[PDB]
């Protein structure tokens, strides 16, 4: 990672045994649960190219996944090289060539560049960039991987309310859509999923009812 | 997390996979125990709103009560936009935009400005203030599902005093309320329903007799 | 915590996760065994209020205890406010209000406030006052759920005289008197409680032997 | 390893338990898995040939895998000759003698002359050198381990897409080439190697599409 | 501890929850078992009186162990009292007053007055003074608590000669005596309690034989 | 250990409890396979010789191998004094007296000796010169608790040649001897104790051949 010392400096520093060890065994325990995402965001902090690259190469198995996340990686590149094209002439002393998206993603860029880069002033942030397409990737993998529409989230017949709702946000967090339409598709699909006893006391509430009004009044 | 380096200055420090992991493992270990909140507010200190939302987004399950926290936030936003408008213009050199209630949740806010609020002279402490907005959060989640009402704490014929005791505090302790509310709720209840041969040797030490005494008086009661 | 840094100067720092699981796990693993107390002081070195009391919030259950700790607080605080009473005023740049008993246990004192009085030239110590009144508290306590009188330490006729020997000073650990008032009572109730065989040699040992030439004496 | 202090100056630090652990436990769950070629690259990041022969020391058992990495270190390091030999006459204050094959594996080099190279202005990155040679090695012995070969890789009549693609990359991580050449061998086998009513629908798709629009048009055949 | 800073002056470190619990590890696993005292002393590099008495403090059980202890270590401060007694006056600025054997033991002295010996110049090194003393004292109790006798180490008829020596120097590593008190039980008792076979090869080897010669010698014996 | 801090300066540190646990579980877990020599030897970087003695002291068990080890110092701590023999006088402000053999190994020497020699300018690295020693001994032990010679690894009837290559050099890993007799005698020895079916095909490659060509030709 790129980390500021004890003395007000960006440096690079080795990634630790416990970053390496605590990202494989995530993945080892959890697959590609919603929850791995902000894991890898939060384990990544700080991370070049070069690191990214580690992280995602320790993961065992899921293949079909990490090739899915290498496609997506390279259409975001794409789209950098059409929206950043890079000039051609001699770098000047005091400067950095520009990067192209095979060097964000770490492919053509050393080490050396992408320190360079992260720590220029004003900086060019390669690994976040890059960590950008990474999650947009991981994104598409967790949505692929989740089993269940929705759609199919009904509450049974004697299921405790609570348990129901938990099924239906941990669903949702899966799906692949802005937050705004999760939301509002969420209020009423809520009730409407709701079993019929339920459904009864939450139409009463009228609309605008807060999550914990609903979890009261469904209480038994 | 922001800490101070030797320069004194307050700096970036990333979230580590120790405190990512020890925050996990409590949520799977103990749920909604009101011991939790302590351990959240110990393992989030210094915590920027993109650190807070990291911890919330890795609690696997109990999304019920998640929602319920982001409604919470949600709350605490609107009302801390109500009291403090931010006011259109350009940002001097040196200096921050005012945060919204969205910001300080770290929605619609950059890591850079978090750690510009944070950091800046004096500071906005935009961490401690989601920090708050969630532990009132927290706070509803640990009293929502608390299995038992003090009011059902009764002692047994034949349970130990000490152990009523724990059960009665244990339960207070779940409970959303100022401390002088739940020093009434103790005052009403806990020599009430002690069983009848304990609550005749409390009624006689008095209202005065420490927990200390309460619990040597009953020592075999 | 409080600590000193690498260059020299008392800077206010995090609990550490492993302080705070090092605490959860002696109290979930030894309850209010008396050793429970000098792990709590040592993992406590350097606390804030803010910090003491975030250690005993994480106390798994034992309320009763805990409600007990809370009392013998109070009362540490209402000595405190009798021997230190505030005198009102508007408080002077480059200085700090004087503190209460409910300031030092940290219920009515911010953070910011605790790390003025601890790193104030010269300091007022509020966190190893707290602790102080917190320790008198937990000796409370492991007196409490101390099940034996050490008058009931005897040893057994086939027991060897080094296993009463570690059952009675066990038990003596958890007794709340003076150091003097345990030493003296033992160099005689040791004797007294001990087997017929065991008393037979030892009183034959004289007066002022050392437990090392008594567990010699008595090795069979 | 090699590590960088205040001063902004490259200095010497033990190699830690921690990473000596790391290493010798992933050695011992995952052998000559893919994976653990990025592993070693990660765990050995500013290491010292020296540092480097304590880690391939420390591996249990695996020696005849260990010996043949000893012989594509040899070849690297008799090319190295051939490429930079070493010119005789007196070192010069302040300066280093030029490394040899041996000097850069660590056999005909003290500790302090790896130093002197890694921290030398401009660097003689000898522990990059040798972690290269190791790596060249490392992955030998990954496709000399490996149990399948990409041709034998055919998806069953019953099984998911998704599982025929996971076992069909799994084995070509294993394989030794360059990524333009696996590209090559995915273009020749995937599609081809599919079931007859997969295959159907991928070569309706055709040459351009995703490997996610792949896996989309066969989640049921 | 007392640890040193990069001012280059020795300052107060908090005692770490890993060596607390490293401690408390090794005394519930290995009980006084002779390497209980260098993982004892190692642990408590650098330790003030009051971190020597938190460790004590933390052991679990064997408390007619360490009642002993505490005896030793009243011997040993009656002794310092009276080869170094204490001289009464006001104590001058930037200055210490002179420690009794109560003051080392932590038992009298604060922890700054332990911080202002140990980091004064010349230090006056309390902590390591009443280490040695604490030290002593488990000598003892690994010498009380260890089973056997090294004149009970015998070799048996179909013992293999080196399950012998280990035995013999485990039980003499349990002796509370000087090095060359050992040394001198060593030439008394080995080959002599060895069994007719060894014995004969030893005698034949002789005095001067080392130990790898003599274990050699009886490989099949 | 001796360590450079922060600020470009050798300073001592404690040794760990991480590092010290780290070699107690080594030797429960391995003993003396070859392994524990390049484990001790990175365990001890930056060792005093008051390090190395905590260190060895700790080894639980096989007193017999540990007393081969004290006798194997002695041995190379005569032939040091016999080398640099050390001359009388008064030692001068500025200046550091000579060590001795036993010294070096710590048995005569303070600590803070060991920090004047480690730190001198220039060093007198006793920490490195003793851990040589130790090395040693320490491979003295690997040999001796090395049950099998290298002429006894035959590779089976029906025995992958793989795992034939890995008893050999597994094997040859714990004698003593240099690397240049380890090589030379390995070469035709391999091939003497394959099966009588990889002989052949071994013997068809002619002489030097790599083990990497010679695993290929006998995979079946
Ligand atoms: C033609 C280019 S491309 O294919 O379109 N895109 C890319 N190719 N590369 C890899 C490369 F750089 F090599 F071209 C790309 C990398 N890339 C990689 C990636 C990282 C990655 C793994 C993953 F699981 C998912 C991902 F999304 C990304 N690893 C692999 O591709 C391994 N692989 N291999 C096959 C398979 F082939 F076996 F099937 C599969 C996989 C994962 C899924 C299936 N590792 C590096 C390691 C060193 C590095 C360098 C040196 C050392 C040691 O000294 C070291 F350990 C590492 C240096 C540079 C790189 C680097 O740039 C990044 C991004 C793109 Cl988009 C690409
Ligand atoms: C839209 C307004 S709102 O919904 O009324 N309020 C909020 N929306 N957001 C989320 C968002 F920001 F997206 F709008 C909000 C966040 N928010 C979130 C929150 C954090 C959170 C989790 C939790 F469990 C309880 C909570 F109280 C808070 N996560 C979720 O909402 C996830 N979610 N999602 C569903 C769902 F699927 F059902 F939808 C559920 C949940 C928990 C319960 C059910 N994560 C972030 C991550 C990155 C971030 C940025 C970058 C990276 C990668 O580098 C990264 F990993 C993360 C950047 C910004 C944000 C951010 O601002 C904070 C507060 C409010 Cl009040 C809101
Ligand atoms: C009228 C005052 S008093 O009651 O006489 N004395 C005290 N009240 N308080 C608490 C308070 F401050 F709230 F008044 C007191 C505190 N106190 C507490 C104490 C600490 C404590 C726990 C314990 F197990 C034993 C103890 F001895 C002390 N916690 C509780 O009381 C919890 N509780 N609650 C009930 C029960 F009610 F459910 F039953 C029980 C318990 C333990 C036994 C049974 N926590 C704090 C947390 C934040 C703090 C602030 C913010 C956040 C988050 O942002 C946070 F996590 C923590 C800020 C300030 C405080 C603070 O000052 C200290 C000392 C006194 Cl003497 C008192
Ligand atoms: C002679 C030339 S060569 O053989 O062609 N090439 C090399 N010989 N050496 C080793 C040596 F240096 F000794 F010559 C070489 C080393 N080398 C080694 C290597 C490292 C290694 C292990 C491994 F598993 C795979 C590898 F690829 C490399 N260890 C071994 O060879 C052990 N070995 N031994 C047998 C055997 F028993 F079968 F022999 C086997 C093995 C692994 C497979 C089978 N360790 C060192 C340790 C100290 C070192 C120095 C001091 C201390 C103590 O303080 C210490 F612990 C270690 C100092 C210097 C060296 C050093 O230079 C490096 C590279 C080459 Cl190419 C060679
Ligand atoms: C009176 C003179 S003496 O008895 O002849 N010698 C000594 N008395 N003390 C203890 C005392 F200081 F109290 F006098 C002595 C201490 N001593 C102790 C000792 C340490 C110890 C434990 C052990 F297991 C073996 C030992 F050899 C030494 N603990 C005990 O004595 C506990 N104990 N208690 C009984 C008993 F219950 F049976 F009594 C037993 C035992 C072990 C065996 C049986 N702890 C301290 C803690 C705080 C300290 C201060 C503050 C806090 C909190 O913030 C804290 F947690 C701790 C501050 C000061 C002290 C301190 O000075 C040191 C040395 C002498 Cl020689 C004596
Ligand atoms: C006449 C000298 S010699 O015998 O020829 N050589 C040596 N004697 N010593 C030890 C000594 F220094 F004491 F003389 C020697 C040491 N030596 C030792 C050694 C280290 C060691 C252990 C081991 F397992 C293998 C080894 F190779 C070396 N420990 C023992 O000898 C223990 N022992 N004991 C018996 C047995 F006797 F019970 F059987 C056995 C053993 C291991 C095998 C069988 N520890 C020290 C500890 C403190 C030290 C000082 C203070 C404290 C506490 O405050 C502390 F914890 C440690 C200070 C100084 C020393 C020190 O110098 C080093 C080297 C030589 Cl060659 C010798």
Chains 1, 3, 6 share one sequence.
Not at 187 to 215: F, H, R, S, W, Y
């Amino acid at each position: 990672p790129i980390v500021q010392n004890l003395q007000g400096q960006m440096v690079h520093q080795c990634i630790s045994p416990r970053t390496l060890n605590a990202w494989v065994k995530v993945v080892e325990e959890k697959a590609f649960s919603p929850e791995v995402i902000p894991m890898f965001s939060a384990l990544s902090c700080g991370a070049t190219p070069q690191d990214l690259n580690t992280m995602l190469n320790t993961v065992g198995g899921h293949q079909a996944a990490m090739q899915m996340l290498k496609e997506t990686i390279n259409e975001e590149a794409a789209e950098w090289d059409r929206l950043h094209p890079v000039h051609a002439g001699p770098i000047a002393p005091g400067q950095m060539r520009e990067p192209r998206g095979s060097d964000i993603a770490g492919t053509t860029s050393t080490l050396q560049e992408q320190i360079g880069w992260m720590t220029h002033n004003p900086p060019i942030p390669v690994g976040e960039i890059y960590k950008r397409w990474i999650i947009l990737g991981l994104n598409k993998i967790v949505r692929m991987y989740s089993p269940t529409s929705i759609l199919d989230i009904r509450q049974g017949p004697k299921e405790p309310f609570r348990d129901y709702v938990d099924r239906f946000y941990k669903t949702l967090r899966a799906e692949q859509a802005s937050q705004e339409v999760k939301n509002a598709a969420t209020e009423t699909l809520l009730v409407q999923n709701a079993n019929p006893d339920c459904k009864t006391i939450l139409k009463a509430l009228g609309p605008g009812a807060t999550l914990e009004e609903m979890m009261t009044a469904c209480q038994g």
